[PDB]
Ligand binder design. Structure first.
Ligand code: NA
Lengths: 255, 395
């Protein structure tokens, strides 16, 4: 989790926000996915949020569901996902890497064993999509024991008690998914919660600036990136081009 | 923080995205209040009796046990309005939805029986019903889809993932995350996140309560065993509930064996699966070596759930209930036997429980035993499936 601390420290000295893109590992193919990731990085991403394909993502929209299908057809497995992570980390040493997991993948071979494996390949944080704070204990405990930041989502329908818990158990950053936005950010800073990143439909440059201006440490592009991949499945060369272009713009807006 | 315990031993829980928690908490609170409201109890009982047809008969088999020392009774859920035990609980959840001031119902279905059940309760109680269904199940169940539309339900086909159940069930939960303030999600079995396993059990417990009073009145004693099929576990837990503290009564759950446990093509996660986290709960399930959720298999579409209600996993673990499996062929034979000797066409799901009872009877014919099988439904729906098979065999 130290990588996240050092990232935000730096971003503050430059009065800049973080731009974090999300992608499903192995989509649309192992080697292509690796070039995409290298592109996102070279294009200016401050960090990465990487999904591991699951059979039943009960918490993802259709854009992600298809990306997950594409990765399975390519014969992608969790084991293969870990070899990729090692390669990405071997090439980019300081960039924070976060995983979006589903409970069963983490539980399968033992919770402690999963986080130990993450510590090995160089992962910095893990967000388990279907584990609310109420059931988080064994997950956040294993995460902390292996120096992994447990990330939690702060939903729109959040109450004060939820805010307190999130601020207390989370590390790395807070995943911001009614209540006035800036009010929500104020309260989190008050309880000393990890830096908040806006991850709700961030798909345009103005939205990133608006997120930063509201007190958020940055923004996460949940599916906007996955959309360019699907659009250009037939043209790998151009796919990278629109990715570079997009990301570059999104990041310029974080200044 | 919850009012009731979301776990049965180590099984259960509420493994859902944070956004859904408020919905589960609101539901649990309304259920507790409702359980204590005599006016709710009175209303529910009125519908079950005057609309649904309860109490259902407890039929003594006349011919099927000849030449053995077994006395077999069948709890007739096949005679309930709708043709299956599902009706009891959809009515209950429908009332609870109204008590919460909700005006819309969301549900998903595979075999299509839960879809039909949710639609009839909604039509009756003036609730707006929308049902998510996987296209591959749609084409395969045109008859049930039509029933749903006759009853005013909107059938939303899902063009996603495996265009199957699991995608519909995920679209059903997604819909609920944004519309829970006005809509209730009517889960169709005793599984999923708390408080569903508890609620579904309680809205099905009359099955066992009636059977006990009926067997005591007819035989003056409790049965030696009560047997029921297990797909998700609602009809079984409905039968078992009232007998749990009666330790001399054996509780036997029957999972589909499909083509045979050894073939890998079956639906018995409780005895042959592995504990995992999915469907919002921690329970035994059918999954690969690396944790992907597999598909279960059975001739009966209604037992095709790749997991099982958490309370059943617990009862098994502590040894209060025993679970076995029965293959397609064994179920097919029990289906034929009941039609021929008793004049009752049972659902293929129910036939799995009957097959195991026939097995207990035929293996030890001089053993004196008093058995009760929960006939969870009628098999008119299965007529064509059974016909095609027997012809593919020249029968
Ligand atoms: Na099952």
């Amino acid at each position: 989790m130290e990588r996240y601390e050092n990232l935000f420290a730096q971003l503050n000295d430059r009065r800049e926000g973080a731009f974090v893109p999300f992608v499903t590992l192995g989509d649309p193919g192992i080697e292509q996915s690796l070039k995409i990731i290298d592109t996102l990085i070279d294009a200016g991403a401050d960090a990465l949020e990487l999904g591991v394909p699951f059979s039943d993502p009960l918490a993802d929209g259709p854009t992600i569901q298809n990306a997950n299908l594409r990765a399975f057809a390519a014969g992608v497995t969790p084991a293969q996902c870990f070899e990729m992570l090692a390669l990405i980390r071997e090439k980019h040493p300081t960039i924070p890497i976060g995983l979006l997991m589903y409970a069963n993948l983490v539980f399968n071979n033992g919770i402690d064993a999963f986080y130990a494996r993450c510590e090995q390949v160089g992962v910095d944080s893990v967000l388990v999509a279907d584990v609310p704070v109420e059931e988080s204990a064994p997950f956040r405990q294993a995460a902390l024991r292996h120096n992994i930041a447990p990330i939690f989502i702060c939903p729109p329908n959040a109450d004060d008690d939820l805010l307190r818990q999130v601020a207390s158990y989370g590390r790395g950053y807070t995943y911001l998914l009614a209540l006035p936005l800036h009010h929500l950010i104020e309260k989190l800073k008050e309880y000393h919660a990890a830096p908040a990143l806006q991850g709700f439909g961030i798909s345009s440059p103005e939205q990133v600036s608006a997120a930063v201006r509201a007190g958020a440490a940055g923004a996460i592009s949940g599916s906007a990136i996955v959309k360019i991949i699907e659009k250009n499945l037939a043209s790998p060369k151009q796919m990278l081009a629109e990715l570079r272009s997009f990301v570059s713009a999104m990041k310029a807006a974080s200044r | 923080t919850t009012l009731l315990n979301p776990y049965f031993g180590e099984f259960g829980g509420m493994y859902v995205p944070q956004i859904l928690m408020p919905a589960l908490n609101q539901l649990e609170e309304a259920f507790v209040s409702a359980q204590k409201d005599p006016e709710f109890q009175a209303q529910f009982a009125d519908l079950l009796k005057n609309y649904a047809g309860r109490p259902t008969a407890l039929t003594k088999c006349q011919n099927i046990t000849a030449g053995t020392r077994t006395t077999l009774y069948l709890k007739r859920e096949d005679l309930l309005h709708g043709g299956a035990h599902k009706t009891n609980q959809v009515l209950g959840q429908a009332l609870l939805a109204k008590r919460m001031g909700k005006s819309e119902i969301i549900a998903e279905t595979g075999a299509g029986q839960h879809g039909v059940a949710s639609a009839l309760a909604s039509a009756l109680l003036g609730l707006k019903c929308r049902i998510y269904m996987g296209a591959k199940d749609v084409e395969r169940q045109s008859p049930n889809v039509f029933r749903m539309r006759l009853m005013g339900a909107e059938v939303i086909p899902v063009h996603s993932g495996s265009a199957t159940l699991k995608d519909a069930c995920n679209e059903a939960l997604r819909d609920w995350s944004g519309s829970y303030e006005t809509a209730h999600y009517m889960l169709g079995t005793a599984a999923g996140p708390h408080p569903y396993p508890t609620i579904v059990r309680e809205f099905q417990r009359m099955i066992g309560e009636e059977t006990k009073a009926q067997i005591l009145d007819k035989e003056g004693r409790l049965p030696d065993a009560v047997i029921a099929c297990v797909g998700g576990g609602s009809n079984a837990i409905g039968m078992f509930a009232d007998f749990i503290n009666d330790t001399s009564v054996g509780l036997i759950g029957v999972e589909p064996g499909g083509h045979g446990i050894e073939t890998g093509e079956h639906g018995a996660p409780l005895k042959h699966g592995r504990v995992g986290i999915y469907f919002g709960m921690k329970a035994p399930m059918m999954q690969t070596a690396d944790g992907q959720i597999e598909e279960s298999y059975s001739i009966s579409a209604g037992l095709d759930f790749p997991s099982v209600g958490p309370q059943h996993a617990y009862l098994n673990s502590i040894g209060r209930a025993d679970y076995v499996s029965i293959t397609d062929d064994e179920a097919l034979e029990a289906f034929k036997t009941l039609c021929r000797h008793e004049g009752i066409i049972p659902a293929l799901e129910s036939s799995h429980a009957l097959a195991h009872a026939l097995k207990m009877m035929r293996e030890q014919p001089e053993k004196e035993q008093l058995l009760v099988v929960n006939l969870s439904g009628r098999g008119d729906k299965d007529i064509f499936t059974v016909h095609d098979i027997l012809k593919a065999r020249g029968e």
